């Protein structure tokens, strides 16, 4: 045991020396010359009200119009953002829901939480009635995040420290992703959907190979638990939001941290993180009730969204990048533009 | 023409959401900690009690879910010193950023202390209340010391000694929590 701990510490030093060798110039030195974005001022265009209790998660459709949201009253509402009309309202078996996902096809919606089960809901059907199609019961801890690859495959991160790739048809785990020591809180799929990154309560982010089923790279830099993780549209970087009141940008090819997005004024943690379509802006949701817009390249703060009176839980950007949706504990969704 | 059909569907959902709004506010949610949901009625009052038996001993993330619950039912038994472990858990929940408005109904079940608590050596039984009572009320006051330290009148602790009538105790304590919440709002308390 004492030998392998010495061998483990020896390799960690070799990885740190390899990471310091490839580091010559910081992202700030390259981005010092290029002009600032200016003041990004954005207003609540829509206020979606219907949820009784606090909203824990939301997700956009691939049509960039329909979005689904989950609240702890045990309801799962699919909204029409353009017209503010409700399309579906789904009563859940377990009222304690923490994650919801919208299928890229737009045919299914997934959600789960403290029940330790991921429930797939068919939105189409011949009847035109919303019913739970399959219930995935493998995780021994609460479901934190779930994201579809296609109609038949879905990845889930739970509080039992494991991520799991599911086959929805047969309803059994195809691959288990073991590595994290703490609760895995968020997932993010690459554009190619051949890799995903997961942020856990061990202050570590891990890059996974979906096809093979093993961890490729482990990213460290955050002090406390990583609550939110989001892939940079390029697919060669990702941003992580932690309880240490910092967001950080990591490069997959450089295998190290690039930038930190922190201000002395901010002492609360980051719940949610999402990029703009170009990636130039980084939006982060805080538990001081407001969202901060960051210049991803320059690290300076661009603007603020100050609509919610309670904790901002989730934060989504449309595929066409026209809007940004914030869910909150005040039980309101707000569309910013 | 298509926008007219979307309004009709939106009307059905809002009519159903109005019926659910009354059932949600009428029901009193409870958290029990020392995966199952239980719904019961006492005097035609709906209670929805969640048990956290199927989760890991790392609580700091999933505990945040119960920031709007009516009351937490904290059960404690009276080798490793399990009583101090329970005091530390109570202290965390009480001083938590999101649980600092939530009252706690305490249940002390199963009925040396001087070795594990040196403050007991000089402790005397309260007049409001035998080496059994001295112990019983020492452990009670140990939990009440934490609840009176940071409360600020927003939430209170309701101790009880367990060994059938336990369901009625939670009913009466929930009444007091709601009463005290409103009385403080109207500035009468």
């Amino acid at each position: 045991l004492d030998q392998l701990r010495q061998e483990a510490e020896q390799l960690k030093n070799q990885i740190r020396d390899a990471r310091k060798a490839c580091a010559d110039a910081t992202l700030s030195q390259i981005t010092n010359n290029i002009d600032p974005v200016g003041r990004i001022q954005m207003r609540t265009r829509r206020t979606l009200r219907g949820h009784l209790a606090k909203i824990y998660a939301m997700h956009w459709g691939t049509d960039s119009r329909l979005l689904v949201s989950a609240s702890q009253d045990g309801k799962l509402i699919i909204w029409d953002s353009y017209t503010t009309n409700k399309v579906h309202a789904i009563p859940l078996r377990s009222s304690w829901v923490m994650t919801c996902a919208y299928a890229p096809s737009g045919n299914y919606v997934a959600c789960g939480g403290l029940d330790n089960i991921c429930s797939i809901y068919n939105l189409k059907t011949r009847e035109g009635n919303v019913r739970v199609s399959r219930e995935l019961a493998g995780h021994t801890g609460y479901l934190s995040c779930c994201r579809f690859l296609d109609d038949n495959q879905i990845v889930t991160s739970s509080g039992d420290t494991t991520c799991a790739l599911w086959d929805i048809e047969t309803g059994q785990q195809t691959t288990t992703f073991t590595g994290h020591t703490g609760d895995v809180m968020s997932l993010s799929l690459a554009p190619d959907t051949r890799l995903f990154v997961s942020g856990a309560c061990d202050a570590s982010a891990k890059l996974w190979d979906v096809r093979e089923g093993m961890c490729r790279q482990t990213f460290t830099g955050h002090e406390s638990d990583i609550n939110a993780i989001c892939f940079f549209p390029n697919g060669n970087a990702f941003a992580t939001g932690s309880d240490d009141a910092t967001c950080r940008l990591f490069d997959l090819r450089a295998d190290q941290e690039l930038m930190t997005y922190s201000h002395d004024n901010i002492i609360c943690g980051i719940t949610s993180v999402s990029f703009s379509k170009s990636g130039r802006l980084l939006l982060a949701g805080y538990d001081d009730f407001n969202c901060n817009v960051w210049d991803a390249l320059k690290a300076d703060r661009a603007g603020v969204l100050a609509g919610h009176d309670n904790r901002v839980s989730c934060l989504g950007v449309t595929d066409d990048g026209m809007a940004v949706a914030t869910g909150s504990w005040d039980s309101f969704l707000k569309i910013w533009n | 023409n298509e926008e007219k059909a979307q309004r009709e569907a939106n009307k059905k959902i809002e009519k159903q959401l109005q019926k659910d709004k009354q059932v949600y506010r009428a029901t009193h949610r409870l958290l029990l900690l020392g995966i199952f949901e239980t719904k019961f009625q006492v005097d035609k009052v709906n209670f929805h009690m969640f048990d956290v038996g199927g989760q890991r001993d790392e609580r700091r993330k999933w505990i945040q879910c119960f920031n709007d619950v009516t009351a937490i039912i904290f059960v404690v038994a009276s080798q490793t010193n399990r009583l101090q472990e329970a005091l530390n858990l109570f202290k965390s929940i009480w001083n938590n950023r999101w649980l600092r408005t939530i009252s706690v109904i305490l249940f002390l079940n199963k009925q040396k202390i001087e070795d594990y608590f040196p403050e007991f050596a000089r402790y005397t039984t309260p007049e409001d209340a035998p080496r059994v009572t001295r112990a019983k009320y020492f452990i009670r006051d140990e939990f009440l010391r934490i609840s009176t330290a940071s409360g600020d009148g927003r939430h209170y602790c309701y101790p009880h000694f367990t060994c059938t009538e336990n369901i009625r105790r939670v009913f009466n304590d929930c009444r007091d929590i709601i009463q005290r919440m409103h009385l403080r709002q109207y500035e009468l308390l």
Epitope: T181, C201, D225, A245, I267, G269 | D57, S92
Partner: nanobody
């Protein structure tokens, strides 16, 4: 990367003294509340003492009260535990654990078996 290293353990005679040090790196030491926790042979992890960010609010378990003193330096990111008049029921692996989030009053999961922000631990043996 968050890294805590315990040193200052060993075999001491009953009624003797030891001084446990805890070297911290990868976080702002001054922003976090610090704890000591021990795991005796054939027992569970039990909390010993904690010390606030500044070093004002201090608490112990009854067993160690008057015999143990927790002190922290902020210039040097180290946590100390001065152990006086030790008895054989103190024999345990002492771990150096910090609360999960900075600035927060509450301190969760510090004895949670799988806790991430906890050191490797140092062995203390009280025998004749």
């Amino acid at each position: 990367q968050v890294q805590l290293q315990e040193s200052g353990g060993g075999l001491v005679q009953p009624g003797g003294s030891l001084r446990l040090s805890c070297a911290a790196s990868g976080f702002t030491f001054s922003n976090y509340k610090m704890n000591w926790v021990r795991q005796a042979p054939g027992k569970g992890l039990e909390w010993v003492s904690d010390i606030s960010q500044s070093g004002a609010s201090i608490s112990y378990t009854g067993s160690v009260k008057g015999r143990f003193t927790i002190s922290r330096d902020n210039a040097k990111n180290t946590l100390y535990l001065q152990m006086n008049s030790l008895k054989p029921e103190d024999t345990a692996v002492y771990y150096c654990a910090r609360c999960p989030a900075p600035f927060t009053r509450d301190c969760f999961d510090v004895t949670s078996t799988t806790y991430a922000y906890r050191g490797q631990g140092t062995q203390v043996t009280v025998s004749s």
